[PDB]
Amino acid sequence: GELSKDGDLIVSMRILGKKRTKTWHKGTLIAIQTVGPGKKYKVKFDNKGKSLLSGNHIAYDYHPPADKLYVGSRVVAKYKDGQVWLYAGIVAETPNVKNKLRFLIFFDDGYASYVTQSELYPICRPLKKTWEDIEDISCRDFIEEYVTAYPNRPMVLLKSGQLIKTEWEGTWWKSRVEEVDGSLVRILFLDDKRCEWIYRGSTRLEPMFSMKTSS
């Protein structure tokens, strides 16, 4: 059952597709096929290769009008190191003055970043519960809890210069708050002076852990 269109998806459109590296790449939608319970989308990548993909593994090659995205929306966004890569995630906050009109993204591996309105792309056919295709179960479970509770977001008030313990990979590290940016805090780990931007409601921050573990 070949199709030339699926709603707004049309054969020949520009698209992003997910590769097995989990990075996303520009290409062209070359076929739509009904296969079992749904549709498959064949993508020819600009650089190298052809993939047959599910609808949650393609994204539009345009930056959406900001108001079409919501907390919980499934997106691909720019993830910088240094490169620039496109990686999937979930919108955690929409643009407001307090965040300098940026989107907060929680990526599928648990990385967090603010991105601009021109640095994200909507996934075409996400799952209704958008987090159900997140492979990392700890990130999946976190996003379900976060989106379900939203707009209830307990956070710690931190100030530049404040010393706290911050968790990383099973150890609690002496650290310092360097900067606050909206719902993120830039933490300097004192043992090596590398930083990490962490959500101010994350229980990786000792004050937030302390509050959530009290009862």
Binding site: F107, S138, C139, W168, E169, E196, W197, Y199
Partner: peptide, 12 residues
Amino acid sequence: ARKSTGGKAPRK
């Protein structure tokens, strides 16, 4: 200069 992500919650 950043570490690899520690994710959103403490490791289990």
